[PDB]
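Notes, p. 3: input format for complexes.
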Amino acid sequence: MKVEKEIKTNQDIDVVMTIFSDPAFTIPQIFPGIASIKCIEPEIFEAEGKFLAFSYKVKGRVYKGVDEVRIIYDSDRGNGILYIRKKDNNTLQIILEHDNKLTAFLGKPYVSSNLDRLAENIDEIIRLERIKRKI
Ligand SMILES: CCCCCCCCCCCCCC(=O)O
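Output follows (135 residues plus myristic acid):
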């Protein structure tokens, strides 16, 4: 069970991919109603969010590969994998697969709203990221 979004960017695609490898950027930008994020080390996070009446606590690990970021996560609302894949110099694909059908049904519109927002505002978002991070 998956929801996907293509993102077009004119920002340096490898800086973009690197920023998406930081869960402190990616988890709050995509998951529903994230209110807390803790980066234990660069590749490990915990976060808390809420959508509707449902609070949740999610934690996971980031794996970097060739042209790919894979975030493996587990939560009290089901477990999954978030992929960020570079498709070419100007394009990436985000794919979120989640193992809990009920949670997927309720969470999907929040996730989709976040992916649409990211797609529509990616280069302005990344420009301000790069100023703060100095990359
Ligand atoms: C991390 C625990 C709460 C996360 C909420 C995750 C929402 C995932 C939605 C995935 C949507 C695909 C399912 C579908 O096609 O209807």
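The longest helix spans residues 101-133.
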